[PDB]
Amino acid sequence: SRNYLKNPGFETGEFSPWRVSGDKKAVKVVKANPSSNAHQGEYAVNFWLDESFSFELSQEVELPAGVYRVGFWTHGEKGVKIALKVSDYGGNERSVEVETTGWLEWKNPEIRNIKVETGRIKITVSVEGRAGDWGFIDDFYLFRE
Ligand SMILES: OC[C@H]1O[C@@H](O[C@@H]2[C@H](O)[C@@H](O)[C@H](O[C@@H]3[C@H](O)[C@@H](O)[C@H](O)O[C@@H]3CO)O[C@@H]2CO)[C@H](O)[C@@H](O)[C@H]1O
Ligand SMILES: [Ca+2]
């Protein structure tokens, strides 16, 4: 299926056109080493800081009218709080909350059945880290159902 998110797996090694807000210093795009850390390809978003941190990773997409689903893949230190949110599509915001549970214990947050009526959507991932927390984010998808 066509994936409507741009640079959805960070495989350029760069964020663009994703935007980072909040504690930008906690988050980078890396060539995964070991490569296990990425869900697909060679690159992933990696976050870490030695003090508590809060950031958002987001991308806006203009879409043909239709019904969509979005998700991504993450793993990280046991206890990191991550949220996936969708907004601005015509209905109220929807979110999913996940906890990472340890290295390579992959989680796949997903929101389905999003009827896009405004011709656009905003995809936002929120990360709330404790001091020393870390994790990886990769392999976004935005598909028309
Ligand atoms: O569990 C033993 C193994 O740990 C691996 O390290 C894991 C990740 O590969 C690594 O990225 C992560 O490191 C954190 C963060 O991602 C990184 O940016 C930052 O610099 O350090 C953070 C840790 O303080 O740590 C986990 C730990 O399980 C090793 O890759 C592997 O060789 C092996 O030691
Ligand atoms: Ca990737």
PDB file of N, CA and C and ligand atoms in Angstrom, residues 33-34 37 46-48 103 132 134-136, ligand 1:
ATOM      1  N   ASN A  33      23.399   0.585  15.590  1.00  0.00           N
ATOM      2  CA  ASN A  33      24.545  -0.268  15.892  1.00  0.00           C
ATOM      3  C   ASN A  33      24.377  -0.729  17.332  1.00  0.00           C
ATOM      4  N   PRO A  34      23.978  -1.975  17.511  1.00  0.00           N
ATOM      5  CA  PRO A  34      23.722  -2.993  16.510  1.00  0.00           C
ATOM      6  C   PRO A  34      22.498  -2.702  15.645  1.00  0.00           C
ATOM      7  N   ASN A  37      18.600  -2.544  16.470  1.00  0.00           N
ATOM      8  CA  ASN A  37      17.895  -1.432  17.075  1.00  0.00           C
ATOM      9  C   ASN A  37      16.896  -0.771  16.127  1.00  0.00           C
ATOM     10  N   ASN A  46      16.750   7.606  17.759  1.00  0.00           N
ATOM     11  CA  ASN A  46      17.231   7.155  19.050  1.00  0.00           C
ATOM     12  C   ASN A  46      17.125   8.322  20.017  1.00  0.00           C
ATOM     13  N   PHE A  47      16.496   8.093  21.160  1.00  0.00           N
ATOM     14  CA  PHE A  47      16.446   9.105  22.208  1.00  0.00           C
ATOM     15  C   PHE A  47      17.154   8.584  23.451  1.00  0.00           C
ATOM     16  N   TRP A  48      17.733   9.534  24.186  1.00  0.00           N
ATOM     17  CA  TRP A  48      18.407   9.283  25.442  1.00  0.00           C
ATOM     18  C   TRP A  48      18.765  10.614  26.058  1.00  0.00           C
ATOM     19  N   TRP A 103      15.031  -3.685  25.999  1.00  0.00           N
ATOM     20  CA  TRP A 103      15.740  -3.722  24.729  1.00  0.00           C
ATOM     21  C   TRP A 103      15.152  -4.793  23.827  1.00  0.00           C
ATOM     22  N   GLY A 132      18.083   9.019  32.303  1.00  0.00           N
ATOM     23  CA  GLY A 132      18.735   7.822  31.798  1.00  0.00           C
ATOM     24  C   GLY A 132      17.917   6.997  30.806  1.00  0.00           C
ATOM     25  N   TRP A 134      15.964   5.713  27.453  1.00  0.00           N
ATOM     26  CA  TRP A 134      16.422   5.602  26.089  1.00  0.00           C
ATOM     27  C   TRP A 134      15.472   4.729  25.310  1.00  0.00           C
ATOM     28  N   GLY A 135      15.547   4.839  23.988  1.00  0.00           N
ATOM     29  CA  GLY A 135      14.738   3.989  23.129  1.00  0.00           C
ATOM     30  C   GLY A 135      14.937   4.364  21.682  1.00  0.00           C
ATOM     31  N   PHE A 136      14.212   3.631  20.849  1.00  0.00           N
ATOM     32  CA  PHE A 136      14.291   3.756  19.386  1.00  0.00           C
ATOM     33  C   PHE A 136      12.873   3.816  18.849  1.00  0.00           C
TER      34      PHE A 136
HETATM   35  O1  LIG B   1      21.915  -5.463  26.954  1.00  0.00           O
HETATM   36  C1  LIG B   1      23.266  -5.609  26.582  1.00  0.00           C
HETATM   37  C2  LIG B   1      23.410  -5.023  25.202  1.00  0.00           C
HETATM   38  O2  LIG B   1      23.095  -3.646  25.285  1.00  0.00           O
HETATM   39  C3  LIG B   1      23.072  -3.017  24.029  1.00  0.00           C
HETATM   40  O3  LIG B   1      22.738  -1.696  24.229  1.00  0.00           O
HETATM   41  C4  LIG B   1      21.351  -1.395  24.092  1.00  0.00           C
HETATM   42  C5  LIG B   1      21.216  -0.496  22.855  1.00  0.00           C
HETATM   43  O4  LIG B   1      21.789  -1.100  21.722  1.00  0.00           O
HETATM   44  C6  LIG B   1      21.816   0.877  23.137  1.00  0.00           C
HETATM   45  O5  LIG B   1      21.495   1.773  22.089  1.00  0.00           O
HETATM   46  C7  LIG B   1      21.298   1.470  24.434  1.00  0.00           C
HETATM   47  O6  LIG B   1      21.988   2.654  24.726  1.00  0.00           O
HETATM   48  C8  LIG B   1      21.213   3.737  25.192  1.00  0.00           C
HETATM   49  C9  LIG B   1      20.936   4.723  24.075  1.00  0.00           C
HETATM   50  O7  LIG B   1      20.232   4.091  23.020  1.00  0.00           O
HETATM   51  C10 LIG B   1      22.212   5.354  23.556  1.00  0.00           C
HETATM   52  O8  LIG B   1      21.921   6.396  22.641  1.00  0.00           O
HETATM   53  C11 LIG B   1      22.939   5.947  24.748  1.00  0.00           C
HETATM   54  O9  LIG B   1      24.176   6.412  24.319  1.00  0.00           O
HETATM   55  O10 LIG B   1      23.178   4.964  25.746  1.00  0.00           O
HETATM   56  C12 LIG B   1      21.981   4.460  26.298  1.00  0.00           C
HETATM   57  C13 LIG B   1      22.259   3.494  27.449  1.00  0.00           C
HETATM   58  O11 LIG B   1      22.679   4.231  28.555  1.00  0.00           O
HETATM   59  O12 LIG B   1      21.559   0.579  25.501  1.00  0.00           O
HETATM   60  C14 LIG B   1      20.874  -0.668  25.324  1.00  0.00           C
HETATM   61  C15 LIG B   1      21.115  -1.464  26.609  1.00  0.00           C
HETATM   62  O13 LIG B   1      20.530  -2.768  26.541  1.00  0.00           O
HETATM   63  C16 LIG B   1      24.407  -3.097  23.350  1.00  0.00           C
HETATM   64  O14 LIG B   1      24.273  -2.533  22.057  1.00  0.00           O
HETATM   65  C17 LIG B   1      24.875  -4.530  23.243  1.00  0.00           C
HETATM   66  O15 LIG B   1      26.184  -4.590  22.742  1.00  0.00           O
HETATM   67  C18 LIG B   1      24.809  -5.192  24.611  1.00  0.00           C
HETATM   68  O16 LIG B   1      25.817  -4.657  25.452  1.00  0.00           O
END
